[PDB]
Design a protein around this ligand. Structure first.
Ligand code: HEM
Ligand SMILES: [Fe+3]
Ligand SMILES: [Fe+3]
Lengths: 158, 157, 154, 158, 158, 154, 154
């Protein structure tokens, strides 16, 4: 079942974004583990696995629509120097992912391509809840608890 | 004390078994290397069985106050392809069966009956668990076709 | 080879000094109520003790007599971060000597000794990373927060 | 735990190779499952997970050596149009990875950095005896069973 | 819960489509069982049961909307004489059903019948993933494995 | 008290020397294939290890500094009977010093220290009886029979 | 090609080791020494496993395993004789293994190097060690006591 060329194009853009986010979460989780912030490490590891599953779902949808996934192309990685910086970078990338996902969902709706709209809506719900909500909560917790208290909560049991 | 002739025949049978075991091992690892996991597992089982048989033969030779010759080994007819391996194995096993029949006759003649019981057990093993399976494999390589037989031999991927 | 056994004995002396320092530090950590860090130090002492056991096996297998008499200078810290720094320094020196001994074992073709020393080096490097991470945590979380974490269960 | 700069660069090259291998394995597994080759899809997906673990080990070693990892840079993706081309591309990539790994192991031995050499020897063992040999077996099986029988075995149950 | 007459009409058309699909899948399952293709027969029977569940949901939705279900009508059945023909006929009918479902989803979004839109989107998801994808994969496997190997796979154990 | 702390440090030094001697002897016994005797001396080293740990905790609670750096002379024997003799001699010296320390703790009214040292003395005299029994068994059964018993399994 | 040749040599060595261990085990079991028999049978099994690993490694290197070329079997007439012969064979095999590991390192083949290092560990710290132990024990216990221990339950 051939899909719209525009639908495949925006799906490929979504896949590029998801793979870039997966790689950024990979780097951030590994630097968190290196620093000793174990709780943040596990959370970002689960977030990276979620991004990998999202990318897999996008690839399956693209292959179903007889497209060719653009898995070679990647976006610029924003790697933060310290924990607040990586949290802010993750939140910024998640918000950009939200914007592009809304645009892609609108395009899929205009193209009468409703199964892909369902997958993209599920991806948008996962991104808003598991990623944007958690990261904005983390930023607020850094603001409230303070830097040292948040880092202590992130380090877990030493 | 066992007879000189009986101990000699048993050492011969032991050499046969040792060569068979080595050949079976080489073939099984070759098949594993090629990816034919099912046939590899089967051949490994056969090699283990041959090892057990050789061990029984060694024990028997030792009980008769004779010295086992586990340094002598026959030539290893090794096949380059699966049907070749199967044919080679069948040939070797048939030779071993002939030798075993002769040995059983000698043991019966020399009034050695426990040795003959061991040899008869080994003969059933070599004609059923081995020669029969190999003959069946050759027949199936001819019936199924080499391609289908190899696909069956690969089992799972 | 005389040199391989001498280097193994030097590694053993370093390991026994590490054992004593680790156990002493764990004991004064429990004495101060720093339970989490005290338990971690105790398990590190246990790991170093098992490693010294393995090295004593290896030296005795090489027809060489272990030297359990000697002990390097102990580095005892007055407070938890000082213990972390002293542990890191001791592990740095032990790791440099371990690398030298691994290279020597390669020169003399004592490959089983080299494999055992490589395993010991993996342990030493994970310990070094842990202590560097702990010191950075002291810097970032602060002394009070890090000590509260080291307390664990009150 | 300062690392050597040449060792860090060779580790970054190996990590880039492993990330590109993971991407290629992801695409190949997804197209294999799209075509209905379930057995091959499961095998290649496990291979992709193993390559993700390899990249994780390499990133952790790079970070422990106080060097920044390289995850934005990605090598060229060779994607086949059918199963034998997939096998040929994966086998060629794995052989290239093995050669680079052996060069890196020689460098690590030269520089008296033995922990990285241990990690790289583990990685070489995994690549040779779980990736290279399996792909070689697969190409041999395509040659022996033929194309159609191998595809029948790869499809598994329908 | 009065619904638009157009919505009830398109629901009746979809119900007719699913009922005809159930009849066709029933006949095809029986023919596959008669021919000895136990694997294909089991899959096709599962598909028929799923389509019966789909028709059940459609009838419940029509009745809830205070509309009369049109369960008498049945479209033309396309019956094949061999496995490839039955696969092609099933794929063609499922693609037709996909077209009808997309038109009905567009209508329901136009008519603000959002719960009907949700059940129809679930129907379309089921049709595109379980049915259309499997039949397309089967056609590809007939092309790749060959006819004889595909029929051997469909026979199963004997 | 300073005198109690010094006596406790001395007893701890005997503890550490005994730990090292028993571990070395057990490792040599294992290297020679004496599994039963070697395993017994390994358990004995572990008991010595726990006793030293208790002594370090006690010394720390008294606001003293456990001197884990210093060690005694190791009496390492080249054969099993001589190793038993050396272990017995070390135990005898440790028991004499322990009795003196218990007397000192009673004189200085340090009663929990006295209780801990009394437990140590009970275990030490248990070890002394075991080693004297082993020497008597070496004499009675013969060295060959005793070494066969020490081997255990093959 | 040199690596393949070396691997084939080591394979011949391992096959000979297995063929000698099996004969020795069955002679020892024929004599009634059940414990030694069980140990040597386990040793033969381990050697078979190692030889199989060698075959698999040679095959993965596009080679032809010489599973027909075997070396001289040094069979003993008494338990001390078999122990000594086994120790000798194992020592020679260890020397060969060291040479092969050096060649693998020089030829930049690290996978076979790792396999050979594992084989060397199995040979040195599990086979040569045990046999050296038994050789020492047959002297420390006496021939009669050692044979009684070897006979297990009579
Ligand atoms: C010198 C002061 C030492 C102290 C205070 C000490 C303390 C301890 C303690 C408390 C244990 C736990 C006992 C158990 O859990 O059963 C232990 C076990 C052990 N120690 Fe010692 N030890 C010392 C020296 C050594 C040395 C020098 C070695 C080796 C060269 C060693 C090797 C071991 C081993 C192998 C264990 C057993 C570990 C286990 O059960 O998992 N120890 N030690
Ligand atoms: Fe890799
Ligand atoms: Fe077929």
């Amino acid at each position: 079942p051939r899909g719209s060329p525009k639908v495949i194009s925006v799906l490929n853009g979504l896949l590029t974004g998801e793979l870039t986010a997966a790689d950024q979460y990979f780097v951030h989780a590994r630097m968190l583990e290196n620093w000793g912030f174990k709780v943040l490490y596990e959370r970002i590891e689960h977030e990276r696995h979620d991004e990998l599953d999202h990318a897999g779902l996008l690839i399956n949808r693209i292959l179903f629509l007889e497209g060719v996934p653009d898995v070679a192309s990647r976006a610029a990685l924003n790697i933060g120097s310290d924990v607040p910086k990586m949290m802010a970078n993750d939140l910024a990338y998640e918000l950009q992912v939200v914007d592009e996902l809304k645009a892609a969902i609108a395009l899929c709706e205009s193209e009468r391509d409703y199964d892909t709209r369902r997958i993209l809506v599920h991806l948008l719900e996962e991104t808003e809840q598991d990623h944007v909500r958690w990261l904005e909560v983390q930023v607020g917790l850094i603001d409230k608890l303070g830097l040292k208290n948040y880092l202590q909560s992130a380090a877990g049991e030493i | 004390x066992x007879x000189x002739x009986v101990x000699x025949x048993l050492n011969x049978x032991l050499x046969x078994x040792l060569t068979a075991x080595x050949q079976y091992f080489x073939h099984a690892r070759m098949x594993x290397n090629w990816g034919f996991x099912x046939l590899x597992x089967x051949x490994x089982x056969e090699x283990x069985x041959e090892x057990x048989x050789a061990x029984x033969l060694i024990x028997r030779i030792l009980x008769l106050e004779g010295x086992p010759x586990x340094x002598x080994x026959x030539x290893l007819x090794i096949g380059x392809x699966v049907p070749x391996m199967x044919x080679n194995d069948x040939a070797x096993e048939x030779x071993x069966x002939x030798x075993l029949x002769x040995x059983i006759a000698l043991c019966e003649x020399x009034x050695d009956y426990x040795x003959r019981x061991x040899l008869x057990x080994x003969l059933e093993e070599x004609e059923x668990x081995x020669x029969x399976x190999l003959x069946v494999x050759x027949g199936x390589x001819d019936x199924l076709x080499x391609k289908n037989y190899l696909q069956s031999x690969a089992x799972x991927x | 080879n005389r040199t391989v056994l001498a280097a193994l004995n030097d590694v053993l002396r370093h390991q026994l000094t590490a054992i004593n320092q680790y156990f002493l530090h764990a004991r004064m950590m429990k004495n101060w109520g720093f339970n989490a860090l005290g338990k971690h130090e105790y398990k590190e002492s246990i790991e170093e003790m098992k490693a010294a056991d393995k090295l004593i096996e290896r030296i005795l297998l090489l027809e060489g007599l272990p030297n359990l008499q000697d002990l390097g200078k102990l580095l005892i810290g007055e407070n938890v971060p000082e213990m972390l720094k002293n542990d890191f320094a001791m592990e740095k020196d032990a790791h440099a000597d371990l690398v030298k001994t691994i290279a020597l074992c390669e020169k003399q073709a004592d490959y089983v000794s080299r494999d055992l020393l490589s395993e010991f080096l993996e342990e030493c490097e994970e310990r070094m990373d842990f202590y560097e991470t702990q010191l950075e945590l002291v810097k970032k979380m602060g002394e009070q927060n890090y000590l509260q974490s080291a307390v664990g269960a009150l």
